[PDB]
Write a protein that binds this ligand. Structure first.
Ligand code: SAH
Length: 400
C-alpha cells in the first residue's frame, strides 16, 4: 500500500457514477486531465527532457528524414506549395534538423510551410523557443500560434490534425507519436463464446494491491461490438489484443487527405507487423512500474500495431495505400545514412566527436539497439512509389 492520491480518488468516483472505464478513457485521463495529468503539468523530471528519442540521438536521423522529405517532394512532381505536418514534435528537434539540413535544396525550401500538431502548451512553448526567430522581449507563447524561422520558414501550431489546411499537397511526420496514443484492450472468453473489454474499476477488495484494478466487461461492450470486425476470428480463451483506435482514426484522416490533395506520411515508432497482444507499459523515473501504481505519475506507452494501420488504410479503397513496415535500420541505410556518417565524420577532426557520432549511428541502426524494434511505415498515393521501402513485403491476403 501507500495512501490514496487525489487523482485516484477522482478516478474511483468516475467508476461509481459511470461504471468501470475503458482503457482508452483511462489513458486519456491519466495523461491529459487538467488538474492531475502527466503530459499536462508533471514538472521537474530526472535529466532535461524525459527520455532518449531518435532525433536527440543523432543529427543523422533528422538529416535522413530531411532527404526523405525532398525525395518524396520530387516524386510528387515538385509542387510549388507543400505543407509539412508533424504529429507531436516533442521539443522540435526533428523539425529543426530537417529545416537546417534541407536549406541547400533551394527549390524545395521555397515551397515549404510547417504545421505542428501539439496539444501540450508546455511542449508548444519549447517548440516555439527552439524553432522561431523573435523580435520582441515580452513573448506570450499562447497568443503566438504563427511564427517565422530564422531562415524565414513559416511555422503554425494547431491542437488537432483537423485544423491543418486542406487542398495543398502534404507531408506528414509522426515520430514516436503513435506509441503515446490511447488504446482499448479486449479479451476472448470461451465461457461466453465472445469478446469482452478490459476496464479499470475501483479496487476496494479486502487484499487488493492498488486503488484501481483491471476487470473484464460482463458481456461485449458497445465498443467490443463496434470493432468485432477488427478482432481475430480465432476465439482462444484468454486471448488478448490491444487496438489503437485513436491511431486508426488518425491514419484514416491522413489517408483521406492524401487521396484528396496528394502527399505522404512517414510513421516511425517502436512496434510490430502484427496484432499486439500485450504492451501497455508505465515508466516513472526511468523504472518500469505498475500501470495502476499512482496513475498520473508515470508515462504510459504502447508498442504500435503497424499491421492494423496498413489494413485500415487499404480498406478505404481510395487512391491511398500503406506500404511497410520496414525496420528503422534498413530504412535509414536505404536513405544513405552510412554515406552521410562518413561525410560528417571527415569534416570533424576531433575523434571524440567522431566516436560520439558513430555510437549515435549504431544506436539508430543496430538490431540490438533501435534498428529492428523501431519500424517505419508510409501512407501514400498508390501511383507514386515511396522512397526507402524497397524491402517492404507483399501482403497477398489484403490486396484482393
Ligand atoms: N492527441 C494528441 N495531439 C497532439 N499531440 C499529442 C497527442 N498525443 C501525444 N501528443 C504529443 O506527442 C509527443 C510524444 S513524445 C515524441 C516527441 C518527438 N516526436 C520525439 O521523438 O522527439 C508529445 O510531445 C505529446 O505532446
Amino acid at each position: 500500500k501507500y495512501p490514496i492520491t487525489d487523482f485516484e480518488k477522482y478516478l474511483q468516483d468516475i467508476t461509481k457514477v459511470r461504471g468501470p472505464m475503458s482503457i482508452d478513457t483511462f489513458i486519456k485521463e491519466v495523461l491529459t486531465n487538467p488538474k492531475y495529468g502527466y503530459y499536462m503539468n508533471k514538472d521537474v523530471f530526472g535529466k532535461g527532457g524525459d527520455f532518449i528519442t531518435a532525433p536527440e540521438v543523432s543529427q543523422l536521423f533528422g538529416e535522413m528524414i530531411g532527404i526523405w522529405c525532398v525525395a518524396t517532394w520530387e516524386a510528387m512532381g515538385k509542387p510549388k506549395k507543400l505543407q509539412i505536418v508533424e504529429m507531436g514534435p516533442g521539443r522540435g528537434t526533428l523539425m529543426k534538423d530537417i529545416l537546417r539540413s534541407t536549406k541547400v535544396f533551394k527549390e524545395f525550401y521555397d515551397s515549404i510551410s510547417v504545421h505542428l500538431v501539439e496539444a501540450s502548451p508546455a511542449n508548444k512553448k519549447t517548440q516555439k523557443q527552439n524553432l522561431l526567430y523573435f523580435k520582441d522581449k515580452a513573448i506570450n507563447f499562447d497568443h503566438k500560434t504563427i511564427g517565422e524561422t530564422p531562415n524565414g520558414i513559416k511555422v503554425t501550431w494547431v491542437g488537432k490534425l483537423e485544423e491543418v489546411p486542406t487542398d495543398i499537397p502534404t507531408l506528414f511526420l509522426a515520430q514516436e507519436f503513435f506509441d503515446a496514443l490511447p488504446i482499448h484492450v479486449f479479451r476472448f472468453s470461451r465461457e461466453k463464446n465472445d469478446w469482452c473489454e478490459v476496464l479499470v474499476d475501483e479496487d476496494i477488495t479486502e487484499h487488493g494491491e492498488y486503488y484501481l484494478r483491471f476487470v473484464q466487461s460482463k458481456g461485449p461492450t458497445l465498443m467490443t461490438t463496434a470493432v468485432k470486425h477488427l478482432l481475430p476470428e480465432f476465439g482462444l480463451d484468454g486471448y488478448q489484443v490491444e487496438l489503437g483506435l485513436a491511431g486508426l482514426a488518425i491514419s484514416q484522416q491522413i489517408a483521406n487527405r492524401i487521396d484528396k490533395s496528394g502527399g505522404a506520411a512517414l510513421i516511425i515508432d517502436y512496434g510490430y507487423d502484427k496484432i499486439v497482444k500485450s504492451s501497455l507499459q508505465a515508466i516513472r523515473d526511468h523504472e518500469f512500474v505498475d500501470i495502476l501504481d499512482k496513475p498520473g505519475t508515470a508515462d504510459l506507452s504502447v508498442w504500435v500495431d503497424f499491421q492494423t494501420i496498413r489494413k485500415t488504410v487499404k480498406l478505404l479503397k481510395n487512391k491511398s495505400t500503406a506500404i511497410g513496415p520496414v525496420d528503422q535500420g534498413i530504412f535509414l541505410k536505404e536513405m544513405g545514412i552510412e554515406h552521410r556518417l562518413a561525410q560528417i565524420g571527415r569534416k570533424l577532426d576531433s575523434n571524440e566527436k567522431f566516436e560520439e557520432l558513430v555510437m549515435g549511428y549504431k544506436k539508430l541502426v543496430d538490431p540490438k539497439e533501435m534498428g529492428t524494434n523501431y519500424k517505419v511505415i508510409t501512407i501514400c498515393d498508390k501511383n507514386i512509389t515511396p522512397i526507402g521501402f524497397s524491402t517492404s513485403k507483399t501482403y497477398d491476403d489484403e490486396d484482393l
